[PDB]
Design a protein around this ligand. Structure first.
Ligand SMILES: CCCCCCCCCCC(=O)N[C@@H](Cc1cnc[nH]1)C(=O)N[C@@H](Cc1c[nH]cn1)C(=O)N[C@@H](Cc1ccc(O)cc1)C(=O)N(C)CCc1ccccn1
Ligand SMILES: [Ca+2]
Ligand SMILES: [Zn+2]
Lengths: 309, 322
């Protein structure tokens, strides 16, 4: 059965595929082709030529069917796609066909499509195919960035696996504040949200990546306001606390270095150098990266010392 | 945290004779199930053989006839006879032909017209006439054209503008504008920017950091945060790092040990992870990763084209890297 029905499935695939290609060469663009392909695509959704066949069939049937008959076909196609996605949610071919289909409908139900994306994202919050599809739906339905920002918040807060959510915020925030580099009040609120995340789970690498971005998204250090200066100093002390609790946590060590750079490179030169030594011991696979970073910082410190009157 | 643990008895030496045997015998189930990618399968097999100095054990004349039979009237090349043309398989076909110094086996002017036709107003490329847009296809287009000496056939500045619009907060690149960074897309976009002479637009320190952080304690690389390692990232991640002049930012010995551990000592071949079933796809990217890391029994490999450098030297197509 295992190594017997193996050959059963293969022969069925071989034979159905066989028939699809004969029908195609014959110009028989009909429901029989949809039946045959449904059989194959559920198991192998990356067989792009068969998705192409289904499109050719649907296109042809549209011309020769009543609007109501065409409507029925479309609904059956949505259901087929949803069944395929359940089995293989990370197939480029399936998600593409859904997009092709929705883009051509008279009256697409975009709110239902956004809900499909929410369901899939509950099951796999990192499924980039579904996140791209959501962005497509959002654009088509002209959903405003502020509502998408509300969505990301709930996702970041209800559980982890957040890299895809933070990524999406990095794209939405500049749209609420669009400029030909975030406003300081927005940045301060983002720093607060991310500090929350990484203290809530210091192993959450997604929050550290996003925080490094935040730390570059703003002022310049001789341009630090008293509020930002104060907030960055607070973060620095909070990272030192964490380092005490989690002395194998490399993300927090790296972040201490980056905060000191953000605050005053020359004043913290001695501590920055100490921290590189600690960090290399804790994250030996990154020693070459860390040495190049330290070299870059030391060179920047030279340029700063030379700027002195 | 998500990682593999390598068993103390994992392979730890390179089994070149077993891998060449494995490929030379391949396709003599998942093989019939994979006819839909056959042209790329052939490219994987042939290229890994050539990196191992064993290309002559494959059937050149048979492959040339097959390739000619997969070129459609539009100029594009399909995965197999009777399948539909796509940029993915058009690249694989041109890569194969370049390995064999046999480009004129197909109609080059029609390939060029096919590639040109798939570029969109924003500079992006669709995979085929059905309109899927992915930076994978921007790479397929420019790599195909570069190998043919016809990069000037497309709108190169607009193509650059589109790829650059796909650059993210973390220095990486996704499928389309707004898409999350992923190693596969980073390879495609850095390869594109190598080909088009735009590597100065990459933030090499930031992206290089993101890439080196793919290396897990096992020594293997994942394709994005919080995923499991897979030996094919020895290609996607390492080639990108090499393009951007930061290959030394990963632990080469640890990664080498991980790659060797993915070999099947009885069948030959490499699997995605140690102890898994092998395939020709992971066999290529395992061996090519080792070549990047400097393994003396393997020919040097182009980080842009994933073909032996000696082949690219022959056609004079060797993009400058960082
Ligand atoms: C090699 C020289 C140039 C080729 C560049 C063209 C596209 C490269 C894509 C970059 C990429 O997506 N890389 C990875 C990412 C990944 C790794 N693990 C999960 N994702 C990748 O190639 N993934 C594979 C599927 C996979 C790998 N490991 C486990 N699963 C993939 O999507 N492969 C496609 C694309 C391809 C085509 C030609 C080629 O030389 C290399 C890759 C593929 O092999 N085909 C045949 C397209 C149809 C398809 C898609 C997905 C699965 C099966 N078939
Ligand atoms: Ca031969
Ligand atoms: Zn893989």
């Amino acid at each position: 059965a295992k190594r017997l029905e193996r050959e059963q499935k293969l022969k069925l695939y071989q034979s159905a595929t066989q028939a699809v290609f004969q029908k195609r060469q014959a110009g028989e663009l009909d429901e029989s082709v949809l039946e045959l392909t449904s059989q194959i695509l559920g198991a192998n959704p990356d067989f792009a030529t068969l998705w192409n066949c289904r499109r050719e069939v649907l296109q042809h049937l549209e011309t020769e069917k009543s609007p109501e008959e065409s409507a029925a076909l479309v609904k059956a196609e949505l259901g087929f796609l949803e069944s395929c996605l359940r089995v293989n949610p990370k197939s480029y071919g399936t998600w593409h066909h859904r997009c092709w289909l929705l883009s051509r409908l008279p009256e697409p139900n975009w709110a239902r499509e956004l809900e499909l994306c929410a369901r899939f994202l509950e099951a796999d919050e990192r499924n980039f195919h579904c996140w791209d599809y959501r962005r497509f739906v959002a654009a088509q339905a002209a959903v405003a960035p502020a509502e998408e920002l509300a969505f990301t918040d709930s996702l970041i807060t209800r559980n982890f696996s957040n890299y895809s959510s933070w990524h999406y915020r990095s794209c939405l925030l500049p749209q609420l504040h669009p400029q030909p580099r975030l406003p300081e009040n927005v940045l301060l609120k983002e720093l607060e949200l991310v500090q929350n995340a990484f203290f809530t789970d210091p192993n959450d690498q997604s929050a550290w990546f996003y925080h490094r971005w935040l730390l570059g998204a703003g002022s310049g250090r001789c341009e630090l306001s008293v509020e930002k200066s104060t907030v960055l100093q607070s973060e620095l002390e909070s990272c030192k606390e964490l380092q005490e609790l989690e002395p194998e946590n490399k993300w927090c060590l790296l972040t201490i270095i980056l905060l000191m750079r953000a605050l005053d490179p020359l004043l913290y030169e001695k501590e920055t150098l100490q921290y590189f030594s600690t960090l290399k011991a804790v994250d030996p696979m990154r020693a070459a990266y860390l040495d190049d970073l330290r070299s870059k910082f030391l060179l920047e410190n030279s340029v700063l010392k030379m700027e002195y009157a | 945290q998500k990682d593999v643990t390598i068993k103390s008895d994992a392979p730890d030496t390179l089994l070149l004779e077993k891998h060449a045997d494995y490929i030379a015998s391949y396709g003599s189930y998942e093989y019939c199930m994979s006819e839909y990618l056959r042209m790329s399968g052939v490219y994987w097999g042939l290229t890994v053989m050539d990196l191992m100095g064993q290309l002559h054990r494959m059937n050149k004349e048979e492959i040339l006839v097959f390739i000619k039979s997969c070129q459609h009237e539009c100029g594009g090349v399909s995965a197999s006879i009777g399948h539909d043309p796509h940029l993915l398989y058009t690249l694989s076909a041109v890569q194969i032909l370049t390995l064999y110094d046999s480009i004129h086996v197909i109609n080059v002017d029609k390939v060029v017209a096919y590639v040109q036709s798939l570029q969109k107003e924003d500079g992006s490329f669709a995979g085929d006439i059905w309109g899927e847009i992915d930076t994978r296809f921007s790479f397929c287009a420019v790599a195909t054209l570069a190998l043919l000496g016809k990069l000037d056939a497309i709108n190169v500045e607009k193509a650059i503008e589109f790829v650059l619009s796909c650059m993210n907060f973390d220095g990486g690149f996704g499928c389309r504008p707004g898409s999350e960074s992923h190693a596969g897309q980073i390879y495609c976009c850095t390869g594109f920017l190598a080909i088009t002479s735009q590597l100065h637009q990459v933030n090499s320190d930031l992206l290089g950091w993101w890439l080196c952080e793919r290396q897990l304690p096992s020594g293997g690389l994942n394709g994005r945060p919080e995923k499991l390692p897979d030996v094919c990232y020895s290609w996607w991640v390492l080639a990108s790092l090499k393009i951007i002049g930061r290959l030394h930012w990963i632990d080469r010995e640890k990664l080498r040990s991980f790659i060797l551990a993915c070999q099947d000592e009885e069948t030959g071949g490499f699997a995605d992870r140690p102890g898994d079933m092998v395939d020709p796809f992971h066999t290529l990217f395992g061996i090519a990763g080792l070549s990047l890391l400097g393994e003396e029994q393997i020919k040097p490999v182009s980080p842009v084209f994933c073909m032996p450098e000696e082949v690219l030297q022959r056609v004079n197509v060797q993009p400058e890297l960082v």
